[PDB]
Amino acid sequence: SLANRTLIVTTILEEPYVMYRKSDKPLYGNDRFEGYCLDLLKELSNILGFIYDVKLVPDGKYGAQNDKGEWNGMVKELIDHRADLAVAPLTITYVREKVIDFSKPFMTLGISILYRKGTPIDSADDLAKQTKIEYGAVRDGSTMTFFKKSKISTYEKMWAFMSSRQQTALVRNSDEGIQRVLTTDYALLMESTSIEYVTQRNCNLTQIGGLIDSKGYGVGTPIGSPYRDKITIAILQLQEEGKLHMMKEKWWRGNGCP
Amino acid sequence: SLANRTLIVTTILEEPYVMYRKSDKPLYGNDRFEGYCLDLLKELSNILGFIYDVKLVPDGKYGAQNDKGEWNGMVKELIDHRADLAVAPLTITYVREKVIDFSKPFMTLGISILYRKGTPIDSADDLAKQTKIEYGAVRDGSTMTFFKKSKISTYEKMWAFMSSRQQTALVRNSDEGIQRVLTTDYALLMESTSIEYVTQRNCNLTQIGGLIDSKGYGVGTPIGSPYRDKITIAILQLQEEGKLHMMKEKWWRGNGCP
Ligand SMILES: O=C(O)[C@@H]1C[C@H]2C[C@@H](Oc3cccc(Cl)c3-c3nnn[nH]3)CC[C@H]2CN1
Ligand SMILES: O=C(O)[C@@H]1C[C@H]2C[C@@H](Oc3cccc(Cl)c3-c3nnn[nH]3)CC[C@H]2CN1
């Protein structure tokens, strides 16, 4: 008992949160998808008693604004009441929190470093004080913005290096970034959850140091939605039951690295 | 801008969040206190424009239910509308969220291990595998409850160890637990924020492994308070500005180790 009607869930394809399910025969509706977020959605529907319809965000975007303030992506779907929930790795940010509501986080993470295994680099500071190893982030991504705006000595220094080499230092997309780490002596600054995913599948790669910032993913709802607080309670129940840990293990685990 | 009235803030003495100021001259009102949470209040009032009056919770408790299902501590002060905000390291929990509201976390942490430096022990699994090194937690503490309830094989084994060896493994209080780590061959399971604090000030001690669970501290409010969402937004602003990082450094950092 949450509402007498199917809830519309906006989402986006992103491994391993929301993925297209491999099948030998055609699949329909929600059955077409799988992943951490689909498991979270099933768990939330079990606890809260709702039926749902998963719809990919038409423009394939998470949510940002133009200079006139027009939002796009999942955030816009919620603002316009075209979706009841957004279940995706959607970062809880100051700007978004002003236009939509978020449950409390289901996952906490931060910016960290993706690099090769067995080198003497152990931190952002180590990278900052040298020039032989290149480093950067996805151009105009969440990680790039963090460095551009930072007033922290080491991060301001890193940004100076990342913006001297517009082209060599920054990457066009995340695919290019991972390819660059694998093919050149390059360290990629990126979301720690994605680092964990990649390092479980590439034994030659490792995370360097800890978290550079702190952020979390939350279920998005339109502003004022009564479902927001019920989803927060369900997330807390899942955490205390150990189910958030089991869901992360399920999707993140690789078959092993020596 | 936020409220016409001076907000009543319930809090509790807990180093380095809320402490009594050491002065040689009498201190009055809010000037009697200092700490991470007093700095957080200053920053939140600077953003939101409210005035506040800090009051230590009479019973000196965070908030739990007794046998009659009656709440105590800061939680009870909020329930009864004797406080507008609770600004303290108050864990966001499923039970509390049922009776009060919380801002999104201003600090994330988890259970971890405090032990002596330079040993071969590197994780909970290393401790679980043996019996020579005793390990445990504060009796009926948050940390003990986690182990008692866990379905994770490693932690279920650790609970079996703790419950069977209760007289030595389970400690009466935090002080007793820290003395055990210092005087005996004992590892203490406890909140990671408190481990960081202790290890910055005692070079003989270290944190073992990473985080065993995930939890956050939030600003508590009575259910329905309009200040809750404003607080959440101010917390997001402070993190993005790097002020939460600066505040954590200010109060946690020690003078170093060899
Ligand atoms: O709310 C948001 O905008 C993001 C959208 C989305 C962004 C995804 O970004 C990556 C995804 C995979 C691999 C990498 Cl290498 C990155 C990355 N990008 N910037 N820094 N690292 C991370 C997961 C999601 C987290 N919420
Ligand atoms: O909302 C709550 O009830 C708690 C209450 C309070 C608990 C404090 O816990 C410790 C603090 C310092 C040292 C230690 Cl050793 C402990 C601890 N860890 N496990 N058992 N005891 C941490 C601060 C607050 C965290 N929120």
Swiss-Prot record, chains A, B:
Intrachain disulfide bonds: 203-257
Physiological role: Ionotropic glutamate receptor that functions as a cation-permeable ligand-gated ion channel, gated by L-glutamate and the glutamatergic agonist kainic acid. L-glutamate acts as an excitatory neurotransmitter at many synapses in the central nervous system. Binding of the excitatory neurotransmitter L-glutamate induces a conformation change, leading to the opening of the cation channel, and thereby converts the chemical signal to an electrical impulse. The receptor then desensitizes rapidly and enters a transient inactive state, characterized by the presence of bound agonist.
Protein name: Glutamate receptor ionotropic, kainate 1
Phosphothreonine: residues carrying this PTM: 199
Extracellular topological intervals: 120-258
Binding site for L-glutamate: 89, 91, 96, 142-143, 191
Cellular location(s): Cell membrane; Postsynaptic cell membrane
Note: The postsynaptic actions of Glu are mediated by a variety of receptors that are named according to their selective agonists. This receptor binds domoate > kainate > L-glutamate = quisqualate > CNQX = DNQX > AMPA > dihydrokainate > NMDA.
Residues with glycosylation annotation: 4, 119, 204
Phosphoserine: residues carrying this PTM: 163
Similarity-based family: Belongs to the glutamate-gated ion channel (TC 1.A.10.1) family. GRIK1 subfamily.
Included range, full protein: 443 to 820 of 918
UniProt organism field: Homo sapiens
The protein's assembly and partners: Homotetramer or heterotetramer of pore-forming glutamate receptor subunits. Tetramers may be formed by the dimerization of dimers. Can form functional heteromeric receptors with GRIK5. Can form functional heteromeric receptors with GRIK4. Interacts with KLHL17.
